[PDB]
Design a protein around this ligand. Sequence first.
Ligand SMILES: Nc1ncnc2c1ncn2[C@@H]1O[C@H](COP(=O)(O)OP(=O)(O)OC[C@H]2O[C@H](O)[C@H](O)[C@@H]2O)[C@@H](O)[C@H]1O
Length: 265
Amino acid sequence: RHSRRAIAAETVEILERGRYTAPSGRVVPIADHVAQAVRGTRLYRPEKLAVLLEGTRIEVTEETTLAAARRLTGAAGDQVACLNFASAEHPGGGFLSGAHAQEEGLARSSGLYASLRAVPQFYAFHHRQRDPLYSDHLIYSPGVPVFRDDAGRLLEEPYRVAFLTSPAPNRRAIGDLRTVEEIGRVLRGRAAKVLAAARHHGHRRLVLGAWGCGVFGNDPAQVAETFAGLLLDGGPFAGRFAHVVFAVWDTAPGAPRHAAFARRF
Ligand SMILES: Nc1ncnc2c1ncn2[C@@H]1O[C@H](COP(=O)(O)OP(=O)(O)OC[C@H]2O[C@H](O)[C@H](O)[C@@H]2O)[C@@H](O)[C@H]1O
Protein backbone atom coordinates (compact mmCIF):
# COMPACT_ATOMS: atom_id res chain seq x y z
CA ARG A 1 0.00 0.00 0.00
CA HIS A 2 2.74 2.49 0.77
CA SER A 3 4.45 1.92 -2.57
CA ARG A 4 1.12 2.27 -4.40
CA ARG A 5 0.44 5.51 -2.50
CA ALA A 6 3.87 6.86 -3.53
CA ILE A 7 3.28 5.93 -7.17
CA ALA A 8 -0.14 7.58 -7.11
CA ALA A 9 1.30 10.81 -5.76
CA GLU A 10 4.05 10.74 -8.39
CA THR A 11 1.42 10.32 -11.11
CA VAL A 12 -0.50 13.32 -9.81
CA GLU A 13 2.79 15.34 -9.88
CA ILE A 14 3.40 14.15 -13.45
CA LEU A 15 -0.08 15.22 -14.51
CA GLU A 16 0.53 18.69 -13.01
CA ARG A 17 4.05 19.19 -14.43
CA GLY A 18 3.17 17.75 -17.86
CA ARG A 19 6.21 15.46 -18.27
CA TYR A 20 7.96 12.49 -16.64
CA THR A 21 11.37 10.88 -16.70
CA ALA A 22 11.58 7.39 -18.16
CA PRO A 23 14.09 4.83 -16.91
CA SER A 24 16.50 5.56 -19.78
CA GLY A 25 16.54 9.17 -18.67
CA ARG A 26 14.39 10.32 -21.60
CA VAL A 27 12.05 13.13 -20.51
CA VAL A 28 8.65 12.38 -21.98
CA PRO A 29 6.12 15.21 -22.55
CA ILE A 30 2.45 14.41 -21.82
CA ALA A 31 0.74 17.75 -21.14
CA ASP A 32 -0.80 18.10 -24.59
CA HIS A 33 -2.17 14.57 -24.71
CA VAL A 34 -3.52 14.85 -21.15
CA ALA A 35 -5.19 18.20 -21.95
CA GLN A 36 -6.71 16.73 -25.11
CA ALA A 37 -8.10 13.78 -23.18
CA VAL A 38 -9.63 16.08 -20.55
CA ARG A 39 -11.14 18.46 -23.12
CA GLY A 40 -12.60 15.51 -25.02
CA THR A 41 -14.13 13.86 -21.95
CA ARG A 42 -17.88 13.42 -22.10
CA LEU A 43 -20.55 12.45 -19.63
CA TYR A 44 -23.32 10.29 -21.09
CA ARG A 45 -26.60 10.19 -19.19
CA PRO A 46 -28.56 6.93 -19.19
CA GLU A 47 -31.10 8.14 -21.74
CA LYS A 48 -28.52 9.34 -24.24
CA LEU A 49 -26.94 5.87 -24.20
CA ALA A 50 -30.44 4.40 -24.64
CA VAL A 51 -30.77 6.51 -27.78
CA LEU A 52 -27.48 5.04 -29.09
CA LEU A 53 -28.92 1.54 -28.59
CA GLU A 54 -31.93 2.29 -30.83
CA GLY A 55 -29.42 3.14 -33.53
CA THR A 56 -15.21 -10.90 -34.11
CA ARG A 57 -11.92 -12.17 -32.62
CA ILE A 58 -12.69 -12.98 -28.95
CA GLU A 59 -9.80 -13.80 -26.58
CA VAL A 60 -9.77 -14.53 -22.86
CA THR A 61 -6.35 -13.85 -21.33
CA GLU A 62 -4.76 -13.45 -17.91
CA GLU A 63 -3.49 -10.02 -18.89
CA THR A 64 -4.16 -6.93 -16.93
CA THR A 65 -6.42 -4.39 -18.65
CA LEU A 66 -3.41 -2.26 -19.51
CA ALA A 67 -1.24 -5.11 -20.75
CA ALA A 68 -3.97 -6.21 -23.15
CA ALA A 69 -4.48 -2.61 -24.30
CA ARG A 70 -0.75 -2.19 -24.90
CA ARG A 71 -0.56 -5.41 -26.90
CA LEU A 72 -3.45 -4.41 -29.13
CA THR A 73 -2.20 -0.85 -29.54
CA GLY A 74 1.17 -2.11 -30.83
CA ALA A 75 -0.54 -4.24 -33.52
CA ALA A 76 -2.73 -1.69 -35.35
CA GLY A 77 -3.36 2.05 -35.46
CA ASP A 78 -7.02 2.27 -34.39
CA GLN A 79 -7.41 3.45 -30.79
CA VAL A 80 -8.46 0.69 -28.38
CA ALA A 81 -11.23 1.26 -25.78
CA CYS A 82 -11.00 -0.18 -22.27
CA LEU A 83 -13.64 -0.61 -19.59
CA ASN A 84 -12.72 0.96 -16.25
CA PHE A 85 -14.32 -1.05 -13.44
CA ALA A 86 -15.34 2.21 -11.89
CA SER A 87 -16.16 3.57 -8.50
CA ALA A 88 -19.47 5.43 -8.64
CA GLU A 89 -18.25 7.82 -5.94
CA HIS A 90 -14.53 8.65 -6.37
CA PRO A 91 -12.57 9.29 -9.57
CA GLY A 92 -9.72 6.77 -9.68
CA GLY A 93 -11.24 5.01 -6.67
CA GLY A 94 -8.89 4.83 -3.71
CA PHE A 95 -5.72 5.22 -5.73
CA LEU A 96 -4.24 8.07 -3.69
CA SER A 97 -4.64 6.08 -0.49
CA GLY A 98 -2.82 3.16 -2.10
CA ALA A 99 -5.85 0.94 -2.62
CA HIS A 100 -5.39 -2.03 -4.96
CA ALA A 101 -8.02 -2.84 -7.58
CA GLN A 102 -8.38 -2.34 -11.32
CA GLU A 103 -9.45 1.30 -11.41
CA GLU A 104 -6.66 2.33 -9.05
CA GLY A 105 -4.13 0.68 -11.31
CA LEU A 106 -5.50 2.60 -14.28
CA ALA A 107 -5.34 5.85 -12.30
CA ARG A 108 -1.76 5.21 -11.18
CA SER A 109 -0.64 4.41 -14.73
CA SER A 110 -2.27 6.96 -17.01
CA GLY A 111 -3.99 10.30 -17.37
CA LEU A 112 -7.33 8.81 -16.44
CA TYR A 113 -7.68 10.73 -13.15
CA ALA A 114 -7.23 14.04 -14.92
CA SER A 115 -10.23 13.10 -17.10
CA LEU A 116 -12.49 11.66 -14.39
CA ARG A 117 -11.80 14.40 -11.86
CA ALA A 118 -13.18 16.86 -14.43
CA VAL A 119 -16.64 15.26 -14.32
CA PRO A 120 -17.91 16.07 -10.84
CA GLN A 121 -21.52 15.72 -12.03
CA PHE A 122 -21.07 11.93 -12.34
CA TYR A 123 -19.82 11.53 -8.80
CA ALA A 124 -22.29 14.01 -7.33
CA PHE A 125 -25.19 12.13 -8.91
CA HIS A 126 -24.19 8.89 -7.24
CA HIS A 127 -23.40 10.48 -3.90
CA ARG A 128 -26.89 11.97 -3.77
CA GLN A 129 -28.58 8.85 -5.16
CA ARG A 130 -27.22 6.60 -2.40
CA ASP A 131 -28.23 3.37 -4.09
CA PRO A 132 -25.71 0.61 -4.69
CA LEU A 133 -27.24 -0.30 -8.05
CA TYR A 134 -25.73 3.05 -9.14
CA SER A 135 -26.82 4.14 -12.63
CA ASP A 136 -26.07 3.82 -16.36
CA HIS A 137 -24.16 7.15 -16.46
CA LEU A 138 -20.89 6.68 -18.36
CA ILE A 139 -17.81 8.81 -18.75
CA TYR A 140 -16.05 8.55 -22.08
CA SER A 141 -12.36 9.55 -21.99
CA PRO A 142 -10.69 9.68 -25.44
CA GLY A 143 -6.98 9.41 -26.06
CA VAL A 144 -5.84 9.03 -22.46
CA PRO A 145 -2.07 8.58 -22.32
CA VAL A 146 -0.85 5.44 -20.52
CA PHE A 147 2.69 5.71 -19.22
CA ARG A 148 3.35 2.87 -16.72
CA ASP A 149 3.65 -0.90 -17.04
CA ASP A 150 2.13 -3.49 -14.65
CA ALA A 151 5.00 -3.04 -12.18
CA GLY A 152 4.63 0.74 -12.00
CA ARG A 153 7.68 1.48 -14.20
CA LEU A 154 7.39 4.55 -16.40
CA LEU A 155 7.33 3.82 -20.15
CA GLU A 156 9.88 4.92 -22.70
CA GLU A 157 6.99 5.40 -25.10
CA PRO A 158 3.49 6.14 -23.82
CA TYR A 159 0.44 4.93 -25.72
CA ARG A 160 -3.11 6.21 -25.84
CA VAL A 161 -6.41 4.42 -25.23
CA ALA A 162 -9.99 5.46 -24.68
CA PHE A 163 -11.61 4.63 -21.37
CA LEU A 164 -15.23 3.83 -20.65
CA THR A 165 -16.08 4.52 -17.01
CA SER A 166 -19.20 2.76 -15.80
CA PRO A 167 -19.70 1.27 -12.32
CA ALA A 168 -21.08 -2.23 -12.05
CA PRO A 169 -23.83 -2.58 -9.44
CA ASN A 170 -22.37 -3.07 -5.97
CA ARG A 171 -23.77 -6.54 -5.38
CA ARG A 172 -21.78 -6.88 -2.19
CA ALA A 173 -23.68 -3.95 -0.72
CA ILE A 174 -27.06 -5.14 -2.03
CA GLY A 175 -26.74 -8.67 -0.70
CA ASP A 176 -29.83 -10.73 -1.46
CA LEU A 177 -32.21 -7.78 -1.44
CA ARG A 178 -32.29 -7.74 -5.25
CA THR A 179 -32.92 -11.00 -7.13
CA VAL A 180 -30.40 -12.67 -9.47
CA GLU A 181 -32.61 -11.64 -12.35
CA GLU A 182 -32.89 -8.00 -11.25
CA ILE A 183 -29.09 -7.77 -11.06
CA GLY A 184 -28.86 -9.52 -14.43
CA ARG A 185 -31.19 -6.99 -16.03
CA VAL A 186 -29.17 -4.09 -14.60
CA LEU A 187 -25.90 -5.68 -15.83
CA ARG A 188 -27.26 -6.33 -19.31
CA GLY A 189 -28.68 -2.84 -19.76
CA ARG A 190 -25.51 -1.19 -18.56
CA ALA A 191 -23.11 -3.39 -20.48
CA ALA A 192 -25.15 -2.80 -23.61
CA LYS A 193 -24.70 0.94 -23.08
CA VAL A 194 -20.96 0.58 -22.56
CA LEU A 195 -20.72 -1.30 -25.88
CA ALA A 196 -22.94 1.25 -27.59
CA ALA A 197 -20.73 4.12 -26.44
CA ALA A 198 -17.58 2.29 -27.61
CA ARG A 199 -19.04 1.63 -31.03
CA HIS A 200 -20.50 5.18 -31.33
CA HIS A 201 -17.00 6.57 -30.77
CA GLY A 202 -15.59 4.35 -33.51
CA HIS A 203 -13.78 1.77 -31.38
CA ARG A 204 -13.59 -1.57 -33.08
CA ARG A 205 -11.27 -3.19 -30.50
CA LEU A 206 -12.18 -3.52 -26.82
CA VAL A 207 -10.63 -4.62 -23.61
CA LEU A 208 -13.31 -5.93 -21.23
CA GLY A 209 -13.06 -8.26 -18.24
CA ALA A 210 -14.60 -9.34 -14.96
CA TRP A 211 -16.37 -6.02 -14.37
CA GLY A 212 -17.95 -5.83 -10.93
CA CYS A 213 -16.62 -9.20 -9.81
CA GLY A 214 -14.02 -8.23 -7.21
CA VAL A 215 -14.64 -5.35 -4.86
CA PHE A 216 -18.29 -5.17 -6.00
CA GLY A 217 -18.95 -8.87 -5.46
CA ASN A 218 -20.77 -9.80 -8.66
CA ASP A 219 -20.95 -13.39 -9.87
CA PRO A 220 -18.39 -13.84 -12.65
CA ALA A 221 -20.51 -16.44 -14.43
CA GLN A 222 -23.36 -13.92 -14.58
CA VAL A 223 -21.10 -11.11 -15.82
CA ALA A 224 -19.51 -13.38 -18.46
CA GLU A 225 -23.01 -14.48 -19.53
CA THR A 226 -24.08 -10.82 -19.73
CA PHE A 227 -21.32 -10.06 -22.24
CA ALA A 228 -22.00 -13.33 -24.07
CA GLY A 229 -25.65 -12.49 -24.62
CA LEU A 230 -24.60 -9.18 -26.18
CA LEU A 231 -21.76 -10.51 -28.32
CA LEU A 232 -22.75 -14.10 -29.20
CA ASP A 233 -25.72 -16.06 -30.58
CA GLY A 234 -27.02 -13.23 -32.73
CA GLY A 235 -27.01 -10.72 -29.87
CA PRO A 236 -27.20 -6.98 -30.57
CA PHE A 237 -23.42 -6.52 -30.80
CA ALA A 238 -22.64 -9.79 -32.59
CA GLY A 239 -20.04 -9.07 -35.25
CA ARG A 240 -19.91 -5.34 -34.52
CA PHE A 241 -16.45 -5.29 -33.00
CA ALA A 242 -13.25 -6.52 -34.69
CA HIS A 243 -11.58 -7.78 -31.50
CA VAL A 244 -12.71 -8.15 -27.89
CA VAL A 245 -10.30 -9.25 -25.19
CA PHE A 246 -11.50 -10.35 -21.78
CA ALA A 247 -8.33 -9.51 -19.90
CA VAL A 248 -8.83 -11.08 -16.50
CA TRP A 249 -5.92 -10.77 -14.02
CA ASP A 250 -7.06 -12.56 -10.89
CA THR A 251 -4.46 -13.19 -8.21
CA ALA A 252 -6.80 -15.11 -5.92
CA PRO A 253 -6.20 -18.87 -5.66
CA GLY A 254 -7.74 -20.64 -8.61
CA ALA A 255 -8.21 -17.33 -10.50
CA PRO A 256 -12.01 -17.89 -10.40
CA ARG A 257 -12.90 -14.73 -12.34
CA HIS A 258 -10.61 -15.80 -15.15
CA ALA A 259 -11.93 -19.34 -15.06
CA ALA A 260 -15.55 -18.17 -15.48
CA PHE A 261 -14.68 -16.13 -18.55
CA ALA A 262 -12.46 -18.90 -20.00
CA ARG A 263 -15.34 -21.34 -19.65
CA ARG A 264 -17.86 -19.10 -21.34
CA PHE A 265 -15.70 -17.78 -24.20
N1 LIG B 1 -5.61 -4.75 -13.47
C1 LIG B 1 -6.57 -5.72 -13.77
N2 LIG B 1 -6.72 -6.11 -15.01
C2 LIG B 1 -7.62 -7.04 -15.31
N3 LIG B 1 -8.42 -7.70 -14.42
C3 LIG B 1 -8.25 -7.29 -13.14
C4 LIG B 1 -7.30 -6.28 -12.76
N4 LIG B 1 -7.44 -6.13 -11.34
C5 LIG B 1 -8.32 -6.98 -10.95
N5 LIG B 1 -8.86 -7.72 -11.96
C6 LIG B 1 -9.90 -8.75 -11.98
O1 LIG B 1 -11.17 -8.24 -12.29
C7 LIG B 1 -12.03 -8.32 -11.17
C8 LIG B 1 -12.76 -7.01 -10.95
O2 LIG B 1 -11.84 -5.99 -10.57
P1 LIG B 1 -12.22 -4.94 -9.41
O3 LIG B 1 -11.15 -3.89 -9.54
O4 LIG B 1 -12.39 -5.60 -8.09
O5 LIG B 1 -13.62 -4.37 -9.90
P2 LIG B 1 -15.10 -4.17 -9.33
O6 LIG B 1 -15.90 -3.60 -10.49
O7 LIG B 1 -15.55 -5.45 -8.72
O8 LIG B 1 -14.94 -3.11 -8.17
C9 LIG B 1 -14.93 -1.73 -8.45
C10 LIG B 1 -14.39 -1.00 -7.22
O9 LIG B 1 -13.04 -1.36 -6.99
C11 LIG B 1 -12.24 -0.20 -7.13
O10 LIG B 1 -11.84 0.24 -5.86
C12 LIG B 1 -13.10 0.85 -7.72
O11 LIG B 1 -12.64 2.16 -7.65
C13 LIG B 1 -14.47 0.49 -7.33
O12 LIG B 1 -14.66 1.12 -6.09
C14 LIG B 1 -11.18 -8.80 -10.03
O13 LIG B 1 -11.91 -9.63 -9.18
C15 LIG B 1 -10.04 -9.51 -10.67
O14 LIG B 1 -10.38 -10.84 -10.93
